[PDB]
Amino acid sequence: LALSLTADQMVSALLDAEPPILYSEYDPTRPFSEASMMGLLTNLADRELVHMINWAKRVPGFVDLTLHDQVHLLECAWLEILMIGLVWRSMEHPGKLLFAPNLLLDRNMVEIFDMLLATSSRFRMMNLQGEEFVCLKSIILLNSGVYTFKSLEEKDHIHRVLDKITDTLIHLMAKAGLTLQQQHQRLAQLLLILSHIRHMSNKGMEHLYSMKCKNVVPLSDLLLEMLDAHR
């Protein structure tokens, strides 16, 4: 069913499936330590995960996969998806990360923040479009665990869907009036960012793991299980 969508139907499906922006429990009148502040991020990420799981079901082609493969894709991609959502909604807040509408933070854990800030700056100087963003996010879901799985039929369906979304990105860029050279260049610029997002995710998963070991920042049962998937 996914393979027969047109470009504009793909974008609509993806736009319609967008999850909500949740609030944090941040209270400016309450003092926070680095501990409890990090607890605000992990508490928020846990609640976003529930919405991400139900958003993933609405990504064209996702539920055509075995439950085992859906599990694997989300385990591999969850933090990348949280991060790209973060940098998207931080775009118009230069120098800050809008984790929630009530939680807008500056660099003032530090290294990851600077990377997220650099990525959102990159999105801003590219004038990343909302239609392009939902395409990238779906690409990460389908792409990030595909080479870590006949589970060979499954991989092939994923490749066809990913090609479909490439077609969709190009269609968007042609509609925006880009020359063909510009379409290819922007397509490459957008996909190279996914390498930086994968990098940020790996780094954060390592800091998440040590946070678990220190046992000072609370981590939900779902977050620990996602974390264990990365060993």
């Binding site: 529930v50 799981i53 139900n54 993933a56 439950l67 599990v71 049962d221 299980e225 996602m226």
Partner: peptide, 9 residues
């Protein structure tokens, strides 16, 4: 596995 069953319903 929490993720497995959240995906199921």
């Amino acid at each position: 596995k929490i993720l497995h069953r959240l995906l199921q319903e």
